[PDB]
Design a protein around this nucleic acid. Structure first.
Ligand SMILES: [Mg+2]
Ligand SMILES: [Mg+2]
Ligand SMILES: [Mg+2]
Ligand SMILES: [Mg+2]
Ligand SMILES: [Mg+2]
Ligand SMILES: [Mg+2]
Ligand SMILES: [Mg+2]
Ligand SMILES: [Mg+2]
Ligand SMILES: [Mg+2]
Ligand SMILES: [Zn+2]
Lengths: 94, 176, 134, 136, 38, 135
RNA sequence: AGCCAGGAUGUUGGCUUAGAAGCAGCCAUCAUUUAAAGAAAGCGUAAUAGCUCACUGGUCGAGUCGGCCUGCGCGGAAGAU
RNA sequence: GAUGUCGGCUCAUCACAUCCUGGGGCUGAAGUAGGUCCCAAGGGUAUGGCUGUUCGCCAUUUAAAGUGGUACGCGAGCUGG
């Protein structure tokens, strides 16, 4: 079980996402089902080491957002053009 | 640091005098003195010598390591004593001692007269062997190297002033 | 002290053992006949290994060893000269009963304890010379 | 030495090499050589690189060139004054933006894939990173 | 002495040692391996 | 290198051949060629003796299961162990004449009965005959 | 990391060559005794020998190894009053 | 509403990417002699045949006959091929 600790995003858009990335954190979205999409911020270091394991993309992962725990699956990753970093992740509510 | 942490054991009848940075180690085989780098704090106590870094000095441990190393060989020096051996290789090469002077025949116009410094003494068991005995490791080394310099072992026959332990790798001359 | 391989009834020519053994300090006539006088029981057309133990007084003492492992696989398969490219070019065939024949003779030299251990150490000398186990 | 067989037009306007690459992933092979810098790759360069890495893998395995030199480059010779027309086409390039996978190779151990890419990288005008395939 | 912009360890006995800011390759086995960056 | 999975297996094999085996012979094997070793391996397998060189850190663990738990202080320096599975004695004699002939090593200590044998009294398992001598 | 010890047998593997015996080249790269030892990473010999490594047992006694993202530096860096 | 052009002569001055001499590392460096690189600008660094030539070819020297900058140094200094 992959446990990803996250936070709901207070800001949205280009400016915020860049500032986030600078601060060694990266934006990600949770969509799927009746429930409205959830804007989350993740730690760049912790998630990056996770995704290194192939199992990250097959298994169902729990994304802890302010107490609540959301079971999701890795949908689409947006990678850095040339650096071994992550720009954004799509999480489909499983 | 691993060198500095390891302690120097002052033996019996070996006096250790420490005046801030200035160390004086007396014994049977003579007396040696040294000025330790400011980054080093030396402690006496018991039949031991311990070294450590002084506060604020960055290179502290690196300095302490060398300090230990040196004092250890000073202790060895004024008790056991160091003995460097050199062998003259090649036709005509001879050597003899005249007190504090090593007279050297090395295939030149003039025979070489090498004056010896304090604490280093020489004796010639053969006309082809020089044995140096002393207390300062840095100095006994210096002197050995100086005498070696007169005729460094040539790579075609091994001819020249070589150290006893020296392994003189020789090579064949150009083919044709 | 040197290692050589001379024939069952031949020990005298100049190109193989001539200036190779006579250069150390071994008699070219005292060894040549003392070696063939004891290898008379050993079959004709089989190279037999021999090691020399020389001292400082030019004297010598030898103990003969069993024929080589790449030597007995040529007479058992039906080949004079081996394959240039082993396991890429097949020169002959040897059964499971012929492997133990070479092994029961080599029992004095082989490191192995069991017959199966001495059989596998001949299986290897067969594969690396083109020959196939059939 | 890679070059378009036919073209709609002979010569091309200079243009610019702004923006980031498209084709940022190992889409065919197991390993890739990706551009970190921004520049022009000439066919003579591409070949020099291709040759060196092909030699490396002892022609075992597969290699794919993700890039193609389709831009024609012109040049005015010596003692030729400005104007009097656009210079003659002399060579061809590929505009490389950071993140372009340039080569992909598979059917070779990672160790060898890294070495083969090390040699090819040497005959190139722009900084390169070694990349491995990924799941999304 | 090979004086060049790219100084590398050429054998197992080669050792990279920095003497007075000059990255050097000193070797115990091969004298041809002796290098200085400049 | 030896991983713990591989480390445990070694402990097990020695611990097992410890239970059944009668007389075990602990000794030094430093400064001797392979030609002499492979030879005492042919003398061992014949005389029903089991031969091995095992880590003193592993032999102190593999003998903890008793009765040889007085050979602890015998795992200091190079070690070779000669477990005599078939007939007690066979190695403690095979060693005694291998030592005198080759001059290298000393043979640390002998073990039997779940009682200690010092370096001074190894002539005890060296003067015993056959099984096979009582008739 | 260092220091002591070992680094064996079939076997000089086959083919090739005046010789190729780990060590000119070509092809194969198993198996045995094992603590472990490549049908051999380099120097050497006419070919051998001999020296050393990969690997492993002992000693030692607490750390050690080199990739990742990054801040600031070093070399690359020769000109004319 | 003028900054006289190539070459020579006379007189130079600087750079060093060093021709010689000096120090030194490698060498496929036995010696002698080379090859290559590093340091180094203190001084030194041909005369003739041919051509306006610089250059170049050649002859014969020399430790060497350096490479460049100086309005391709130098005509209120000379020459004028
Ligand atoms: Mg903006
Ligand atoms: Mg200096
Ligand atoms: Mg005017
Ligand atoms: Mg210079
Ligand atoms: Mg050069
Ligand atoms: Mg000058
Ligand atoms: Mg000249
Ligand atoms: Mg002018
Ligand atoms: Mg005038
Ligand atoms: Zn080297």
């Amino acid at each position: 079980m992959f446990t990803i600790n996250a936070e709901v995003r207070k800001e949205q858009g280009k400016g915020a996402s860049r500032r986030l990335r600078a601060a060694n954190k990266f934006p990600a979205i949770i969509y799927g089902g009746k429930e409205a999409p959830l804007a989350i911020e993740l730690d760049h270091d912790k998630v990056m080491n996770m995704q290194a394991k192939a199992e990250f993309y097959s298994e169902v992962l729990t994304i802890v957002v302010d107490g609540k725990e959301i079971k999701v699956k890795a949908q689409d990753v947006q990678r850095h053009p040339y650096k071994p970093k992550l720009q954004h992740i799509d999480f489909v509510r499983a | 640091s691993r060198v500095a942490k390891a302690p120097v054991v002052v033996p019996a009848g070996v006096d250790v005098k420490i005046n801030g940075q200035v160390i004086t180690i007396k014994g049977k085989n003579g007396e040696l003195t040294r000025t330790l780098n400011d980054a080093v704090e030396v402690k006496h106590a018991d039949n031991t010598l311990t070294f450590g870094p002084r506060d604020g000095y960055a290179d502290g441990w690196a300095q302490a390591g060398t300090a230990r190393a040196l004092l250890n060989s000073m202790v060895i020096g004024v008790t056991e004593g160091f003995t460097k051996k050199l062998q003259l290789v090649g036709v005509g090469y001879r050597a003899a001692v005249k007190g504090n002077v090593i007279n050297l025949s090395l295939g030149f116009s003039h025979p070489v007269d090498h004056q010896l410094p304090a604490g280093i003494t020489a004796e010639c068991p053969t006309q082809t062997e020089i044995v140096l005995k002393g207390a300062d490791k840095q100095v006994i080394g210096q002197v050995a190297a100086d005498l070696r310099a007169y005729r460094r072992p040539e790579p075609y026959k091994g001819k020249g002033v070589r150290y006893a332990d020296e392994v003189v790798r020789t090579k064949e001359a150009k083919k044709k | 002290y040197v290692k050589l391989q001379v024939a069952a009834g031949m020990a005298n020519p100049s190109p193989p053992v001539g200036p190779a053994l006579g250069q150390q300090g071994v008699n070219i006539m005292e060894f040549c006949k003392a070696f063939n006088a004891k290898t008379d029981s050993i079959e004709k057309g089989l190279p037999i290994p021999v090691v020399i133990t020389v001292y400082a007084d030019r004297s010598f003492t030898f103990v003969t060893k069993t024929p080589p492992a790449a030597v007995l696989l040529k007479k058992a398969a039906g080949i004079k000269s081996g394959s240039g490219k082993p396991n890429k070019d097949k020169v002959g065939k040897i059964s499971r009963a012929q492997l133990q024949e070479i092994a029961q003779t080599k029992a004095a030299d082989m490191t192995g304890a069991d017959i199966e251990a001495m059989t596998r150490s001949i299986e290897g000398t067969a594969r690396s010379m083109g020959l196939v186990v059939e | 030495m890679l070059q378009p067989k036919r073209t709609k037009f002979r010569k091309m306007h200079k243009g610019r090499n702004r923006g980031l690459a498209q084709g940022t992933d190992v889409s065919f092979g197991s390993f890739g050589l990706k551009a970190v810098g921004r520049g022009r790759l000439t066919a003579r360069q591409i070949e020099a690189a291709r040759r060196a890495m092909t030699r490396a893998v002892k022609r075992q395995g597969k290699i794919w060139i993700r890039v193609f030199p389709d831009k024609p480059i012109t040049e005015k010779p010596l003692a030729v004054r400005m104007g009097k027309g656009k210079g003659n086409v002399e060579y061809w390039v590929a505009l490389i933006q950071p993140g372009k996978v340039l080569y992909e190779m598979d059917g070779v151990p990672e160790e060898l894939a890294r070495e083969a890419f090390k040699l090819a990288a040497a005959k190139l005008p722009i900084k390169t990173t070694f990349v491995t395939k990924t799941v999304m | 002495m090979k004086v060049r912009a790219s100084v590398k360890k050429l054998c197992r006995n080669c050792k990279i040692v920095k003497r007075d800011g000059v990255i050097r390759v000193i070797c115990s086995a091969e004298p041809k391996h002796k290098q200085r960056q400049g | 290198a030896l991983n713990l999975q591989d480390k445990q297996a070694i402990v097990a094999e020695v611990s097992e051949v410890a239970k059944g085996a009668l007389s075990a012979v602990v000794a030094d094997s430093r400064g001797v060629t392979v030609d002499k070793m492979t030879e005492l391996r042919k003398a061992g397998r014949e005389a029903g003796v089991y031969m091995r060189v095992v880590r003193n850190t592993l032999l102190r663990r593999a003998v903890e299961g008793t009765p040889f738990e007085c050979l602890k202080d015998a795992f200091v320096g190079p070690t070779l162990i000669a477990y005599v599975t078939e007939h007690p004695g066979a190695a403690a004699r095979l060693f005694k004449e291998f030592a005198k002939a080759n001059a290298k090593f000393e043979v640390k200590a002998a073990a039997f009965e779940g009682e200690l044998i010092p370096a001074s009294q190894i002539d005890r398992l060296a003067t015993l005959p056959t099984y096979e001598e009582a008739i």
